[PDB]
Amino acid sequence: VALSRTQVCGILREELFQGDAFHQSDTHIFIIMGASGDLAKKKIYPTIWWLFRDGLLPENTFIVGYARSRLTVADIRKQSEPFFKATPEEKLKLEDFFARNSYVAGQYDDAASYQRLNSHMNALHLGSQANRLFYLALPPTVYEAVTKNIHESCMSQIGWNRIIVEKPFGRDLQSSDRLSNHISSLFREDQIYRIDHYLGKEMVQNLMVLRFANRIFGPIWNRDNIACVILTFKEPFGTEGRGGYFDEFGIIRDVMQNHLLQMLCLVAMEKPASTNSDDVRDEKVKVLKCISEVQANNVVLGQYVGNPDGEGEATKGYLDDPTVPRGSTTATFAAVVLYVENERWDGVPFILRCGKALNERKAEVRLQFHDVAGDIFHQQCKRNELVIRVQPNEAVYTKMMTKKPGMFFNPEESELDLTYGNRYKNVKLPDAYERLILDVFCGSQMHFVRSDELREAWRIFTPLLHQIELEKPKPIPYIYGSRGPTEADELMKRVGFQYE
Amino acid sequence: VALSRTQVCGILREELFQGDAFHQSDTHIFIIMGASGDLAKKKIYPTIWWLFRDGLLPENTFIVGYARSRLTVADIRKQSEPFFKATPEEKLKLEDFFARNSYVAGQYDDAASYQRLNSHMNALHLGSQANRLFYLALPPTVYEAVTKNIHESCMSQIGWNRIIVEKPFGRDLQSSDRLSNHISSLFREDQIYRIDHYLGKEMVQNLMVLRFANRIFGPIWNRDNIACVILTFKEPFGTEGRGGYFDEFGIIRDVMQNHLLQMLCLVAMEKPASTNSDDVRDEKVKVLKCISEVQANNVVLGQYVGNPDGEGEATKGYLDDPTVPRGSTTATFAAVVLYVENERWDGVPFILRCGKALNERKAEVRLQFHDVAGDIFHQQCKRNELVIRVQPNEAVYTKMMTKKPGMFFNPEESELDLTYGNRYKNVKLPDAYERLILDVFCGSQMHFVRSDELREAWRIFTPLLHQIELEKPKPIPYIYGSRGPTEADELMKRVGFQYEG
């Protein structure tokens, strides 16, 4: 039997209600700092709406917008409601949602503006007691000011205070440390939520059960059995005339140093002492501490060019973006190989491969197993694989050999679906991002990057990023819609990976 | 895409043709010694018919019946054809089949009778050159005479000569050795086919690919990961007024010392040097040599009694069989635990559990894996299993833990079908026994018990069988249609097995 999207929300609501960590009865205030900006308009307001609509917020929740512009809730609603995908059935819930919304104009480094915000909050029903959740939907160039002022003027004295922080988390170890040390002098680790929009909560929890609940998979999750691991993140669209911001960061900073490294950690970790957030993040950090600074011989960069035979956007290269400097050498593609130098993984290449303007949307973890030690089937045996796909359609499946009916033993490659076993025919999930914000309401930090974790991430990548900035290597061109530079394929072959 | 019975036979015929082992061009003679008897009538003639019909015999194959009774092919046909399950589509093939049939009346210890059989064979088209395949469908009490006479009078000088031999393969080490030494002084090991009717050729070959072609299963196929192995053989019917012959053997000799021990060997074997029959049988023998003589404390015997609440035969106990001695102590049920004392298996109980008048038909291999080393999911994790069912309906599947959708990590037990992977939806195969006779045409001895293998099988069980015969322990009663004596459950719990509740 299948589970609808609405039945999954019933199960979740019931779990939130039974559990101590989500306080359904207490008052909550959700503060969107930067409520006028595009992130708020297109992602945050719609998503807090989805939570509200799904019955997954505490019943007493208020949304307070705060930005420089002098706006009404009516304005917020006009700019944001198109991205809510609201239906006619939801007209009542949408009224009730907007009734819980308010806006406060202010400057980001003006103490008086923050006192108005605090008074505004205090003036809500039970505002002085509410749990306060601050979403910092702002460039990190104002984070020092905003976190300073929030701490001085805006903290609940009764409820908890939690802040959600957006990438970039610096651009290297030293800038990351300046920002992280600043925020840490004001907020405890258990108040800081560094979010990863791309972390697929359902698939990472599937993976943990698959590995840690089962003798079939746990004993082969090591270098004696695994030839390589591939972490793939692919977008088919380029920068869409908006690449100016990206151009200052590049693909490694954008998605690899943060998101792909988290996935590596979840694949490579030792079994945690428990499923508590900090036991799990302890094991994520132990992994990073076993990884050496990556060197350039393990890296292939590319930059997309237009396709002469394309139509629409496909005909334009990265440099044809009007907001991108002519002769920028910033990479829109990287393939990178890391090693986890410990008992479980030494020698196993972890291959991170991502880019824009590629052939498909795909986000995926692939374990490719070694060949059998001694093939009694005339070399017909392909390497087994375990694939966890997140980004197009979620799936867990194992590629393996099976007998073809007939005389003697002719194995053929086959696939089995391990997504929810035999149990559930269809499963329609809540948005992963919706679930991630819900985590912050529940006090669950497992899938958010910890300070120690972040430092290790920057140590790994920083020598290389500095070297790229100083040596300015020309990245390899690749046609829009292709799989990227063929040199990425060569790096993968060279370190142990097999295609056909 | 699903595969019909006819499509599977197309694939097999093509394989027989491309392979050097089959010889689609040679003439073959299939001799059913004991053609008048029940086994021929109900199993052998039907099965050689199914081979013929399926297009799996060499084009020039003759079937020669031989027994004492003075019969025609018309007689054979009348008694056997009901068990052929022939349809209207097959009317022409059935004519063609019976045209290839002949019968010779003869005594089993009469050299003149065997010369007539040899002359009869020589007189067939290319008879003097044909491969000759002798099915000894006779009690083993005449095997010495029959194999002596066949060797003296009936061997091709040009084609190969192969004999199929039926259990019982003796009743202990000494009797087995007398019979086997006799047959071996006349026939090479490559001519002797000791058959096991119950060996499911398709599932055994599936299993070999599953284990040996994959990193998923091969590395955990050992004592570090497997808590116990269960080999189950269950019939829901009792002896049906025919238990007189069984009564002289008991359930261990009947199905365990032969069939279940072969299944153990296929589960426990090391990876062979190749898939050649004798590399594989070498590994089956290495296993047996690592097994000690089984002791009585590891054995539970039972004997069925009638069910007061039943209907039909279910109301009658084993002793209510008119052909069974009053107060026979013969076991209709056994549960036995063996150990393979080697690097791969030491400590792992191999539990052989079989009998008659039980709750269902089942033939099955079950690997129960150890619990996870430290459970971070609050002890909700059940042991993984790999199950290969042969009857009632073939299946390979794995019990494992999966995440329930929702907030935390609530694993639930689930089953995955591994049989043909995703590839083949529905599959109708030829009978395993059909495939086993075909193996003899192909020269493939993999699934037939070898002389050295047989000796090891008897060494393992002979002290116990002698002890049972001499101390005559009373077997434990169990109601017809139950799962057998609950003491069998206790032996299984005692050695490390976990029930599902």
Numbering used by the authors:
A (entry chain E): 5 to 504
B (entry chain A): 5 to 505
Task: Copy the relevant paper text.
To elucidate the molecular mechanism of G6PD inactivation by KAT9- and CBP-dependent K403 acetylation, we determined the crystal structure of AcK403 G6PD. The protein crystallized in the P1 space group, with eight monomers within the asymmetric unit, and the structure was determined at 2.28 Å resolution. Lysine 403-acetylated G6PD was crystallized without structural or catalytic NADP+, and a close examination of the structure revealed acetylation-dependent conformational changes at the dimer interface and the substrate binding site. This minor conformational change in the structural NADP+ binding site was accompanied by distortion of the β-sheet at the dimer interface (mainly βN) and unwinding of the short αl helix. Third, in AcK403 G6PD, K205 was rotated by ~180° relative to its position in WT G6PD, and held in position by electrostatic interaction with D443. This conformational change was accompanied by the unwinding of helix αf’, the disposition of helix αf away from the substrate binding site, and the reorientation of functionally important residues such as Y202, and H201, that together rendered the enzyme inactive. In summary, K403 acetylation-dependent conformational changes in the NADP+ binding site reshaped the dimer interface and propagated to the substrate binding site via partial unwinding of helices αl and αf’, disposition of helix αf, and deformation of the G6P binding site.
Glucose-6-phosphate dehydrogenase (G6PD) catalyzes the first and rate-limiting reaction in the PPP; the oxidation of glucose-6-phosphate (G6P) to 6-phosphogluconolactone with concomitant reduction of nicotinamide adenine dinucleotide phosphate (NADP+) to NADPH. G6PD is a major source of cellular NADPH and has a primary role in controlling the metabolic flux through the PPP. Each monomer has one G6P binding site (i.e., the catalytic site) and can bind two NADP+ molecules; one is close to the G6P binding site, and the other is the structural NADP+ binding site.
